[PDB]
Amino acid sequence: DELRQEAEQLKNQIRDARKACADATLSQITNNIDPVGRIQMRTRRTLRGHLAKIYAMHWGTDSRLLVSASQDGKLIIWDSYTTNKVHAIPLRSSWVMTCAYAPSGNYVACGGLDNICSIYNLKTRQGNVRVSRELAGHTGYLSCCRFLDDNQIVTSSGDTTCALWDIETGQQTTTFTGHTGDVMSLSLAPDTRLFVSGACDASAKLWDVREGMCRQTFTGHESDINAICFFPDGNAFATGSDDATCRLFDLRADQELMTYSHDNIICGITSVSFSKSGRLLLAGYDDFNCNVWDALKADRAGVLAGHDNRVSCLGVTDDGMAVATGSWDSFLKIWN
Amino acid sequence: LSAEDKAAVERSKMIDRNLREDGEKAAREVKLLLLGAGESGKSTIVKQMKTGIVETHFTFKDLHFKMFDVGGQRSERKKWIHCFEGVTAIIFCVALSDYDLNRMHESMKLFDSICNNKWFTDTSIILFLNKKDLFEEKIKKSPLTICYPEYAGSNTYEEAAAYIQCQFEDLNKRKDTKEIYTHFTCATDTKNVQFVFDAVTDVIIKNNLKDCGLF
Amino acid sequence: WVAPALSAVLIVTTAVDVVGNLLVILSVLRNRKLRNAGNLFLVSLALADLVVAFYPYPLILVAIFYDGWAFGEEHCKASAFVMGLSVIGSVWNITAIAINRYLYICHSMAYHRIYRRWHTPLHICLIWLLTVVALLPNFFVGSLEYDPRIYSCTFIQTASTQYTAAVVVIHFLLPIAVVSFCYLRIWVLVLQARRKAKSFLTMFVVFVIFAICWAPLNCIGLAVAINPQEMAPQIPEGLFVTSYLLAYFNSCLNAIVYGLLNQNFRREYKRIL
Amino acid sequence: IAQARKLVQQLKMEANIDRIKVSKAAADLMAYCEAHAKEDPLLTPVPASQNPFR
Amino acid sequence: VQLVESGGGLVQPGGSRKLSCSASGFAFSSFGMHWVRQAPEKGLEWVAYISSGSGTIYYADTVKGRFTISRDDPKNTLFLQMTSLRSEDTAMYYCVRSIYYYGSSPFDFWGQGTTLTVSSDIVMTQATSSVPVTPGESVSISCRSSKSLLHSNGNTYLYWFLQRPGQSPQLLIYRMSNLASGVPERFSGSGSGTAFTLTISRLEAEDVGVYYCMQHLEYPLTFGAGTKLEL
Ligand SMILES: CCC(=O)NCC[C@@H]1CCc2ccc3c(c21)CCO3
C-alpha cells in the first residue's frame, strides 16, 4: 500500500536507529561484578481466611498492611506483622481481577468483570467501610488499577484503552488509546508523571499523564504480556511475557536490554516485581512456584516454592523487608 | 505479651467466623454458566424464571440457582474463562432452526472449543436445543445435504433430530468425566426447569462421591 | 505348614500395614484441604491399626523364634490387651467411616446446617475410648493366657459365656449391619438418580470384604460359647489356625481398601513421596 | 482512512526523539544498583534482632 | 454519632437503678463500650468495659460483682445494673465508645451525663492544680506515671483528654503523639519513659478547661488528678 508505504519507511528508520544505537550489549558489560550467590528465603507468616482463588494484592505505604482480592467476594485488609484481619469488605460482583491500596492509606479500590471500578473509604466517622463512588464507562473487563493521588487514579481495562479518572466528579479526565487488544497490566513511575502498560498483542507502550498522548512503544515479545513492573530508578522496567521470557527494557536507550529465559521453564509469568536496590528481579511463574533472577547476571538464584497452585500476584514492600505472594491455592504467604 | 492487642485479636476472630458463615452459605448455591451463539436461543431459557456479567438467580425445589450470562463481554475468551473454574454446569443452547441460515457449523465449533478445553475437564455440559418446531416445518423443503453432505437417512423430523444429537455428542473428547445431557425445549415452562434441576441433582451426587472417594 | 504360614503372612502384613498407615498419617497432615473434610475418621483407623503393627506382632515373632513363650507373664497380660485396642478399634472405625459417608453423600443439608467444624476432631475420641471401656472387664473376668494352640496370646473364648458373647455382638453383628445398610443406601441413591437425568463391585463388597474373612472366628466363638463343655474341646486345630491367619490378614486389608485404591488420596501420594 | 493518517502521525512523532548509547544506560543502572546495595534487606541477609518478622 | 442516655435520679441508699445508653448513627455492633464516672467537682474514674460480641466484661475492682453491664446489638442500647448505694457509688456517669484495630483511635465520642444521690494499678498522677493563662503564648502540662508505659510493641498507651466547663470531654492526643480527628494542629504531645508533657502552641478562648490522662496498658484504666487551665 502506497499510503502505508510511508509508515513502512518510518518503521524502517526507527528500527535502524534502534539497531545502530546498540554499540554494546549489557551482558558483556556486567562480567567483572561478583554474583550475588545462592539466596535462601523462608516462610515467616502464612495467612488463611480466603476460600476462593486469589487474583491480586497490593502492599501498603507503611509496609505493614496489605489488601487482597478473591472470587469469594470479600476484600480483606491483612495486618502483615501479627497476621490479624483489620477489615472485611463484602463486594457486589464477585468477579474481581485487581485491587489497589491508597498511598495515603485512606482508600482501597477494586474492579472486575462488571466493568466498574469502586472506591472504598477506610477512615469514616462510623465504624464501617462504605463505597465512595463507582466509576463506570468501560466497555471491557477492568484489568489493573493503580492510584496516583487521593483524587486521581488510572485504570486499565480490556477495551484496548487506558483511562485517567477523577474520584470527586467521576468523569474520565483523560483517555489513552493506541493498543490493539486487551490491555492487561499497568504500572506508574515513582514520580507519578509517566506510566506504562502491557497489551495482549505483546507490545508495551509509555503514556504521559499531563499530555495524555502516548510517548513510546516497545516490542520484542512473542505471545502476550501478563504483568509488568517498573524499575525503582525510573529509567527502565521489567515485563512478564507468556512464554517464560521475562524482559528488561529501557527508556533512554529505547531498546531491549536483556532477557531472562531457561530451558526447563515452559509456563508463563504471572507477576513481576523488583527489590529496593534493584539487584533482584522477582517473577511469579505459572509452574506452581515463584523465582528470583539477577537483574545483571540473568541467572537463577533461588526457587521460592511452597505453593500448591499457580501464583497470581506478587509484591515487594516499600522498605524492601518482605516479599508476599498470592496464589490460586487460596493461601497468602509473606517471605523474608 | 498483649496489652490492648487482645481486642484486635477478638475482632480478627469474629470477622473470621462471619466470613466462615458467609462462605458456608455460598456452597449450597449452584452456579451455571450460560453460553451459546444465538441471542434468541438464550432468551427462551433466560425467560422461564425470574455491562459484563449479567447475573440472574432463581429458587426451585428448595435449591438456589445462580445463572451467569457472559456473552456480552466482547473480548478474548481465553483471558477470563478460567474465572469460572468451579461452575457446577455449563448450559449450552444452540439452534436447530439454523442448519442452513453453516451457522450450525459455527456453533459446532463453539461447542468443540468449550467442551474439550484445558479447564472444564470435570464439568458436565447441559445441551439445550431450540426452535424445534420451526425446524420441523422448514425441514420438509430443505434437505440436510446443503450443510450435511454425509447424511444418508430419510428426510423426517425424528431422524434429523437424532442425527444432529449424535453429531453434537460426537465432538466430546472425554467420555469418562463429562455427561452431555440433551433435551429438546418445549412450550411448557415447567419441563425446562425440571430437566435443569434433574441434571444438576445428578452432578451434585457425583461431585459428592468424588470427595469421599467411592470411585 | 502351621508355623510357616503364620510367620510368612504376618511379616508382610506388618510391613505393608505400618508403611501404609504412616503414609496416610503424613498425607492427611500434609494438606489443609484434606484435613477438615470429615475424612479424619480414617487417620484414627490408620493409628489404631498401626498400634498392632508396633507392639503385638514383633513380640509374636519373638515367641515364634523361641518355639514357645519366651517373655514373662507381665508381657503376656499386655501383649493381648494392645491387640484388643487395635482389632476392636479397627472394626469400629470402618463403621464410623461408614456413617460419615452416609451423612455427606446422602442427606447433606443437615450436615451443612449442623456443621462439622470442631465436632469431628473430638468425635474420634468417644468411640476410641469406648474401646477400652468395653475392654476394661477383660481384666476383671480373669481371662487371657498363652494358649499354645495358636502360639500367639489372645482372647480365649472358653473363659466366660458373658464375654464370649458380648464380644461377638458388639464387634461383629453391628459393624456388619451398619456397614451393609449405609453402603447399600448410598449405592441405591446413586443408581436411582443416574437414570432420571438420562455396581456391587466397587462400592459394596470392597467395603465388607472384612466380613467374609472375620466370620469363621465369630462362628467358632458362638459355637464354643453355646456349649463350652463339649463343643469347645472338639474342634479341628487347623480350622482355628486358618481362622486366626485370616484375622491377622485383615489387619493390612484395612489399608488397601481405604488406601491405595482411592482417587482423592492416590493423587497426593506422589507429591509427598 | 483517517485512522491510518493518525497512526502515521503517531509513528513520526515517535521517531523524532533523542537517543542515548546503551553503555551509558548500563553504567547508570550498575551505579544505581551498587550504591544502594547496602539498603537491600533481600540482597544482604539481616540478623533477626532487627527483623520485623520472626 | 450521637449518644443519649437516661435513667438517672435520686434514690434511697441500698436500692437499685437502671441506666440505658442509646446509640444511633453508627455501627454500634462493632464498637467496644465503656462507662466512665465523674465525682462532683472531682476527677474521672473507669467503671466497666464491654467488648463487641460480648466476651470480655472486665470490671473495676471497687464495684466488682455489685455492678452488671450488658448490651443489646439489634436495638443498639447499653444497660448497666447497679445494686445498693454508697458514697463512691454515686457520681455522674458517661457513655464512651471505642474500637480496637491496628490504626484505630479508642475513646472517640462521649455521652452527656446523668445524676444520682450523694457526694497494683498504675497510679498516674501529677496534679499541677491550676495554671493561669493569657491568650497567645505556649503552655506545657506535665504528667508522671507509676510504671513504664512503653510496651514491647514500641508504642506507649496513654491518652490525653480535655473537658471544657459545661459539657462532656473529648479526646486530644492518643499514644502521646497522634492528633485526634478534628482537633486543631496547635496541640502537641511528647515524652518518653515515664515523663510526658503536653504542649499547646497558642492559647485561645475555647482552650479553657480541665486536662485528664489515661493509661491503657492494663485494666483497670486509671485516670489522673486533672489540671485546670483557667484564665
Ligand atoms: C469369637 C470371639 C472373638 O474371636 N473376638 C475377637 C478376639 C480378639 C482377638 C484378640 C483379642 C484380645 C482381646 C479381646 C478381643 C480379641 C475381643 C475382646 O477382647
XYZ file of N, CA and C in Angstrom, chain A residues 49-56 67-78 85 87-96 98-99 110 120, chain B residues 15-26:
141
model
N -7.839 -17.595 55.413
C -9.108 -16.913 55.565
C -9.813 -16.700 54.245
N -9.084 -16.831 53.144
C -9.693 -16.820 51.825
C -10.143 -18.226 51.456
N -11.249 -18.307 50.723
C -11.808 -19.586 50.301
C -11.682 -19.841 48.810
N -11.903 -18.831 47.977
C -11.763 -18.985 46.539
C -10.336 -18.633 46.125
N -10.091 -18.571 44.820
C -8.758 -18.267 44.320
C -8.418 -16.799 44.550
N -7.131 -16.524 44.744
C -6.642 -15.164 44.943
C -6.084 -14.653 43.623
N -6.491 -13.446 43.231
C -6.105 -12.885 41.943
C -5.175 -11.686 42.026
N -5.220 -10.903 43.103
C -4.375 -9.722 43.184
C -4.207 -9.295 44.633
N -3.793 -5.522 51.184
C -5.167 -5.847 50.821
C -5.142 -6.891 49.713
N -6.060 -7.853 49.789
C -6.133 -8.939 48.822
C -7.563 -9.104 48.329
N -7.693 -9.536 47.075
C -8.986 -9.737 46.438
C -9.104 -11.178 45.969
N -10.295 -11.748 46.126
C -10.535 -13.140 45.779
C -11.945 -13.271 45.218
N -12.187 -14.382 44.523
C -13.502 -14.668 43.963
C -14.549 -14.976 45.024
N -14.143 -15.150 46.284
C -15.100 -15.367 47.362
C -16.069 -14.195 47.480
N -15.650 -13.002 47.068
C -16.460 -11.813 47.207
C -16.099 -10.934 48.380
N -14.952 -11.165 49.011
C -14.517 -10.406 50.173
C -13.187 -9.730 49.880
N -13.040 -8.502 50.365
C -11.797 -7.748 50.264
C -11.241 -7.580 51.670
N -10.095 -8.201 51.935
C -9.541 -8.304 53.280
C -8.298 -7.431 53.367
N -8.195 -6.658 54.444
C -7.027 -5.827 54.717
C -6.255 -6.507 55.843
N -5.217 -7.255 55.484
C -4.450 -8.012 56.464
C -3.489 -7.108 57.224
N -6.712 -9.698 60.883
C -7.566 -9.131 59.848
C -8.128 -7.809 60.355
N -9.987 -5.358 58.238
C -11.289 -5.106 57.641
C -11.662 -6.258 56.721
N -12.967 -6.441 56.533
C -13.511 -7.422 55.594
C -14.627 -6.731 54.816
N -14.360 -6.409 53.556
C -15.277 -5.624 52.735
C -16.068 -6.582 51.852
N -17.389 -6.679 52.015
C -18.189 -7.519 51.112
C -18.451 -6.787 49.803
N -18.239 -7.483 48.693
C -18.373 -6.893 47.371
C -19.742 -7.207 46.775
N -20.032 -6.551 45.652
C -21.289 -6.760 44.938
C -21.135 -7.816 43.847
N -20.197 -7.605 42.928
C -19.897 -8.562 41.868
C -18.654 -9.345 42.272
N -18.828 -10.638 42.536
C -17.726 -11.475 42.992
C -16.888 -11.973 41.822
N -16.427 -11.058 40.975
C -15.582 -11.383 39.832
C -14.394 -10.438 39.763
N -13.821 -10.108 40.922
C -12.737 -9.138 40.974
C -11.503 -9.689 40.270
N -8.504 -7.249 40.202
C -7.422 -6.360 40.599
C -7.830 -5.616 41.859
N -6.839 -5.033 42.529
C -7.072 -4.223 43.714
C -5.915 -3.252 43.887
N -11.076 -1.727 43.865
C -11.017 -2.996 43.159
C -11.970 -2.960 41.973
N -13.487 2.690 48.023
C -13.974 2.420 49.369
C -13.267 3.320 50.370
N -14.518 -11.412 62.716
C -14.625 -11.206 61.282
C -13.995 -12.370 60.518
N -13.560 -13.404 61.238
C -13.240 -14.702 60.667
C -14.415 -15.662 60.712
N -15.139 -15.719 61.831
C -16.353 -16.521 61.903
C -17.460 -15.974 61.011
N -17.577 -14.646 60.892
C -18.548 -14.083 59.961
C -18.216 -14.473 58.527
N -16.932 -14.419 58.168
C -16.526 -14.810 56.825
C -16.745 -16.300 56.603
N -16.505 -17.117 57.633
C -16.761 -18.548 57.510
C -18.240 -18.823 57.266
N -19.118 -18.132 57.997
C -20.550 -18.294 57.769
C -20.934 -17.858 56.360
N -20.390 -16.727 55.902
C -20.697 -16.254 54.556
C -20.205 -17.224 53.489
N -19.057 -17.865 53.716
C -18.536 -18.809 52.745
C -19.231 -20.151 52.760
N -19.725 -20.577 53.920
C -20.518 -21.794 54.011
C -21.947 -21.589 53.531
N -22.412 -20.341 53.463
C -23.692 -20.039 52.840
C -23.633 -20.050 51.319
N -22.442 -19.951 50.732
C -22.286 -19.889 49.285
C -21.908 -21.226 48.662
